[PDB]
Amino acid sequence: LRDNIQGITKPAIRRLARRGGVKRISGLIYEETRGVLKVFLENVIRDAVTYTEHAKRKTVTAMDVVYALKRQGRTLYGFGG
Amino acid sequence: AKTRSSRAGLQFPVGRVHRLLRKGNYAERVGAGAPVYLAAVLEYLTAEILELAGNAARDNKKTRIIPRHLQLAVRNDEELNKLLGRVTIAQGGVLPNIQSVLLP
Amino acid sequence: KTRSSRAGLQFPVGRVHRLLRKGNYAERVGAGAPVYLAAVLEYLTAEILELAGNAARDNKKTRIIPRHLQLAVRNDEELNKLLGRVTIAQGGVLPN
Amino acid sequence: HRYRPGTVALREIRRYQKSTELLIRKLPFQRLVREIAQDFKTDLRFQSSAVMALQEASEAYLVALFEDTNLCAIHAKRVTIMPKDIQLARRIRGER
Amino acid sequence: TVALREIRRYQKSTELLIRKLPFQRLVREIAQDFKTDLRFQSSAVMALQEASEAYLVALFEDTNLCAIHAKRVTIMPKDIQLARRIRGER
Amino acid sequence: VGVNLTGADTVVFYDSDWNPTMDAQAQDRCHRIGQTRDVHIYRLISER
Amino acid sequence: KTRKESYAIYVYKVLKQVHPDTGISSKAMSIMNSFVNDVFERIAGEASRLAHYNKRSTITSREIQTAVRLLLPGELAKHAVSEGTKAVTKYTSAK
Amino acid sequence: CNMRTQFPDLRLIQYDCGKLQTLAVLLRQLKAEGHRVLIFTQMTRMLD
DNA sequence: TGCCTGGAGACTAGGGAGTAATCCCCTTGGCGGTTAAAAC
DNA sequence: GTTTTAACCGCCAAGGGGATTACTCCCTAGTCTCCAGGCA
């Protein structure tokens, strides 16, 4: 597993922008968005892994991600709790 | 045997709310009317959000409420939008909003 | 023999234990939880106080004033993140 | 026949705002999540629900960030979104 | 020239920029609607002034960033509107 | 199944498949109709 | 095979009270359950903090009323307080 | 060149696999008798 | 400086390990197509 | 508009996890009494 940030695809970022209402997109937006998503995922996943490690588990459950997001201030509905 | 929800006239469980308040470590003691008040407030908020969700569902010629309807209901009502400002609804989408300058 | 001295700390492990018990955090508080909490609080206090004292030395002063604490918090990135949503009375803001 | 620039973009804007489906392929996101997590702890297994929750949160975050970026672009009298727009949105939001 | 000197002077200082008596009158006027015959501790009004001035300085910084992004030095009300809209306080 | 390798007359299986049907298809690649020579199948197996 | 307490039946009852004809899906019901749990946690925590500030050892109707006033926006808070006081008055009258 | 870099002998490919030795014998016999051989393997690296 | 309050000193019941069992469920290399999102 | 390729299904193998629910049981907290010293 290496260089997986390229999995966030240019059409995918374009689709997300279109959902956000963007009409025209510069060519340098894709790298910036990849970096921003990398940072956000790093924070959320670190918190979730801490929660899973506290329970002496080896599987990251959806409840752990929900707790991590709630701690970050981004409470998510529909996945329990 | 008559339930406390029946006495209070509510649909949400007063007994369950009382047990949750006692077991949640909020205070040493929990008053008798606290579960009733909390259940009433929860029922009112559920009624508001469900009324708006059902109104959204009827506009789409659909009988069952899907999460998109709940998202539309929450975001279209300013007070509920403020209440659930930092909340993400799974499979909720976003409101249709295209800025005026972008239109031809 | 003091429990704080037994743990080798300066903060009141006994007071921290009483606050954890009286507070409604849990129905049971372990023996090592107050010691750990006191150690963490003491380390954070020592860090912010060292930075504030360095700021006071840089200003040719002998007392830590709220301005020195503000400068110490905002200059250290980790402490700035920890106290990001915190306003310090009579502290001002960083030069720019 | 050839649509003038901007018409297809608005059409797909309307299409993607009508729907609620996820916009990122699930397998690339799963690999990205596993790649990010292996640094923090090796031999970690992700439930499918956890990955779906992460994807939903990330997509919502990116959509809101793009809304802020588009508002930044309309400010300063533009239509295209540029990296400076994302940077300004993030800085005003309190990130970085 | 004078603007930069004024910036440095107020940037180094820590005293409250808003006058105390007008702010106390404003606080009491705002509180009048919520409850009648309200008494205020002096520390309460000082805390309100500290919070309000910190909030305004942070907002002005975000609006300056918004103005610079528009290739302008002057700050305009649209900058305040965008700062609050992006921050989420709208 | 569209490959018509009737030119050869010997098949050597370097390794054996778990499914004998796949080996049968590999053999039939050369043993099919229209082939005018005897076909010999050699299977190589490592001892123990 | 274990009990999992949820507000599904109560949310369905309230939905039938409001819209006798409409229904609700599993994801929407999960979202509603999460919303009820979140609002319950908010109000309970605010009430606990209010009790702690005033050096009170109990959570009463006053604490939850103040919590609802603090949390909910204007019209929502006013109607919620009306509903709660109606509920508590009826509960006391029924004894 | 010989004093500058040393490559593994191509002979050691057959020496490291008994299948290759047996297949060398079998293929030499088959070419002597005048046949054509199909070699089937499950792995493409084995093809290399 | 005069306290309250944190600290020994004895019981005591239960929360939280250990320890099965027990049920659920894929798990992973290398292969071979084959479309529809990407890429150009 | 034209070309690439990578999600994704299928395979073929032998059993292993790895979170859950019941028993037991034993440290370890809580509760109470008394006291002196830490601190406001």
Helix (H) or strand (E) holding D46: strand D45-46
Q: Do B81 and G49 contact (CB within 8 A), yes or no?
A: no
**Nearest in space to D65 (alpha carbons), one of E62, A16, C85:** A16
Alpha-carbon distance of C69 to C90, in angstroms, equals 10
User: Could you give the CA distance from residue A49 to residue D34 in angstroms, rounded to a whole number?
Assistant: 11
What is the per-residue burial (b if ≥16 Cβ within 10 Å, else e) of H2-29?
A: eeeeeeeeeeeeeeeeeeeebbeeebee
In whole angstroms, give the CA distance from residue B72 to residue E87.
22
Token pair of D74 as six digits:
């309309």
Our CA-based measurement puts residue G26 at a distance from the nearest CA of chain C, in whole angstroms, of 34
H42 SS3 class:
coil
> What six digits make up the tokens of C21?
């018990």
Residue B89 is given by DSSP the state E
Q: Which of D19, D20, D60 has the CB atom closest to B88's CB atom?
A: D60
> Are residues B90 and A77 in contact, defined by beta-carbon separation less than 8 angstroms?
yes
Structure tokens at C37: 């909490």
Give the phi and the psi of residue F40 in degrees, each rounded to 5.
Answer: -115, 135
Cα-Cα end-to-end distance for chain D: 46
Q: How far is CA B98 from CA B92, B94, D29, E28, in A?
A: 18, 11, 28, 42
> Using CB atoms within 10 A of its CB, is residue C86 exposed (0-12), middle (13-18) or buried (19+)?
exposed
Q: Where are the domains of chain A?
A: 1-79
C-alpha H28, offset from chain centre:
11
The position carrying tokens 């090796």 is D42
Nearest CA in chain D to A21: D13
Residue D6 has a CB neighbour count (10 Å cut-off) of: 14
Q: Check: CB of residue B81 under 8 Å from CB of residue B75.
A: yes
Q: What is the DSSP code string of C3-57?
A: HHHHHT-SS-HHHHHHHHHHTTT-S---SHHHHHHHHHHHHHHHHHHHHHHHHHH
Q: What is the CATH number of domain B1-104?
A: 1.10.20.10
CA–C1' span, D58 to J19, in Å? 28
Nearest alpha carbon to residue F27 among E89, H40, A8, D54 = H40
Are A21 and B86 a contacting pair at CB < 8 A?
no
Residue by residue, DSSP assigns H12-48 as HHHHT-HHHHHHHHHHHHHHHHT--EEEE-S-HHHH-
Span between the terminal Cα atoms of chain C, in Å: 52
G2: left (phi over 0), alpha (psi -120 to 50) or beta: beta
Q: Give me the count of residues in chain G.
A: 95
Dig out the tokens for C10 from the structure.
Answer: 């300066």
* Cα-to-chain-centroid distance, residue C17: 17
- What's the rounded Cα separation, in Å, for the pair H47 and C63? 80
Tokens 């209010």 -> residue: G50
Q: Which 49-68 residues of chain D touch chain E by CB within 8 A?
A: 68
Report in angstroms the alpha-carbon separations of D53 from A36, B35, E39, F8, H14. 18, 32, 49, 57, 54
Overall number of domains in chain G: 1
DSSP class of residue H7 equals P
CB B67 within 8 A of CB G31: yes
> How far, in Å, is the CA of F26 from the C1' of nucleotide I31?
15
User: Does residue D71 belong to the interface with chain E, where contact is any CB pair within 8 Å?
Assistant: yes
Contact G60 B7 (CB under 8 A): no
Q: Angle formed by the axes of helices G61-71 and B33-59, to 10°?
A: 30
Helices (H) and strands (E) in chain B, counts: 5, 3
What crossing angle do the helices spanning D48-74 and E77-87 adopt, rounded to 10°? 180
DSSP A23: S
Across all strands, nucleotide nearest C14 (CA–C1'): I6
The C-alpha atoms of residue E24 and residue E18 are separated, in whole angstroms, by: 10
Q: Which nucleotides of I are covered by protein (CB under 7 A)?
A: 5-8, 15-16, 30-32, 37-39
- CB distance G84 to G68 below 8 Å: yes
Cβ contacts of E36 within 8 Å, gap of 6 or more: none
DSSP D43: S
**Residue among A21, A69, A77 whose CB faces B98 most closely:** A21
The DSSP bridge pattern shows strands A76-77 and B88-89 to be parallel
Quickly give F17 CA vs J11 C1' distance in Å: 11
- Å from D35 (CA) to J5 (C1')? 22
- Residue E9's contacts (CB-CB under 8 Å, 6 or more residues apart) are none
Q: From D69, B65, B33, C64, select the one nearest A29 (Cα to Cα).
A: D69
Contact D17, B93 (CB under 8 A): yes
Check A19 against D43: CB less than 8 A apart. no
Nucleotide nearest C1 (Cα, C1'):
I7
Both structure tokens of C61: 């002063």
Distance to chain G for B99, nearest Cα, Å: 28
Which run of H or of E encompasses B27?
none
**Domain positions in chain B:** 1-104
Are residues B22 and B43 in contact, defined by beta-carbon separation less than 8 angstroms? no
- Partner residue opposite B92 with nearest CB, options D13, D18, D20: D20
Does C25 reach chain B within 8 Å, measured CB to CB? Answer: yes
Q: Which fold has domain C1-96?
A: Histone, subunit A (1.10.20)
Four-residue CA torsion sign, G71, E56, E71, A35? negative
3-class secondary structure, H45? helix
- Class (C level, CATH) for E1-90: mainly alpha
Q: Where are the alpha helices (DSSP H) in A1-81?
A: 10-19, 29-54, 62-72
Cα D48 from chain centre: 20
3-state secondary structure of E3: helix
Q: Cα separation of E90 and E55, whole Å?
A: 14
Phi, psi dihedral angles at A60 (to 5 degrees): -85, 110
Q: How far apart are CA D32 and CA D34, in angstroms?
A: 5
How many C-alpha atoms does A47 have within 13 Å on its Cβ side? Answer: 20
* Residues D53/A76, Cβ–Cβ less than 8 Å: yes
**What does the DSSP 8-state code read for residue A79?**
S
> Mind spelling out the 3-state secondary structure of E28-87?
HHHHHHHCCCCCCCHHHHHHHHHHHHHHHHHHHHHHHHHHHHCCCCCCCHHHHHHHHHHH
DSSP state of G36: H
> What's the CA gap between E23 and E50, in Å, rounded?
11
Helix (H) or strand (E) holding F40: strand F40-43
Cα(D92)–Cα(E90) distance, rounded to whole angstroms? 13
Determined by cryo-EM
Provide the 8-state DSSP code for B102. Answer: G
Residue (of B51, B45, B53) closest to B11 by Cα position: B45
Q: Which nucleotide is the nearest neighbour of A58, by CA and C1'? A: J18
CATH of D1-96, one of 1.10.10.10, 1.10.20.10, 1.10.4080.10, 2.60.40.420: 1.10.20.10
What residue is closest to J7 (Cα–C1')? D27
* Nearest in space to C2 (alpha carbons), one of C23, C21, C24, C17: C17
Q: Under 8 Å CB-to-CB from A23, ≥6 apart: which residues?
A: B102, D6, D9, D10, D13, D70, D79
Paired tokens of E62: 């975000």
Amino acid at site A30: Y
- b (16+ CB within 10 A) / e for G2-26: eeeeebeebbbbbbeebbeebbbee
Distances (CA, A) of G44 to C31, G39, G90: 28, 8, 22
Rounded CA separation A1/A20 (Å)? 30
First to last CA, chain H: 26
Residue B85 token pair: 């400002």
C-alpha to C-alpha distance for F23 and F38, rounded to whole angstroms: 18
Please state, as a whole number, how many other Cβ atoms lie within 10 Å of the Cβ of residue C84: 10
D45 touches strand J (CB under 7 A): yes
Beta-carbon separation of E69 and D72 below 8 A: yes
- Largest Cα span, chain B: 68
Strand J contact with A6 (CB < 7 A): no
Kind of pairing, strands D45-46 and B29-30?
Answer: unpaired
Point out the residue among D57, D63, D74 whose CB comes nearest to the CB of B99.
Answer: D74
Which chain B residues are closer than 8 Å to G31 by Cβ?
67, 70, 89-90
Q: Where are the alpha helices (DSSP H) in G24-73?
A: 26-53, 61-71
Strands D45-46 and H37-40: unpaired
Q: Tokens representing F19?
A: 């499914």
Q: Between B14-23 and B33-59, two packed helices, what is the crossing angle to 10 degrees?
A: 120
Task: Scan residues 5-64 of G and list those with Cβ closer than 8 Å to B.
Answer: 5, 7, 10-11, 13-15, 17-19, 21-25, 27-28, 31-32, 35-36, 38-40, 43-45, 47-48, 51-52, 56-61, 63-64
d(CA A51, CA A53): 5
Phi, psi (deg, nearest 5) at residue G59: -105, 115
Residue owning tokens 């959806």: A62
The residue to which tokens 């908010």 are assigned: G42
- Please state which CATH class domain A1-79 belongs to: mainly alpha
Distance A40 CA to J22 C1' (A): 42
Rounded to whole angstroms, how far apart are CA atoms D80 and D63?
16
8 Å CB contact between G8 and G29 = yes
Residues of chain B neighbouring D75 (CB-CB closer than 8 A): none
A75 contacts in chain G (CB < 8 Å)? 38
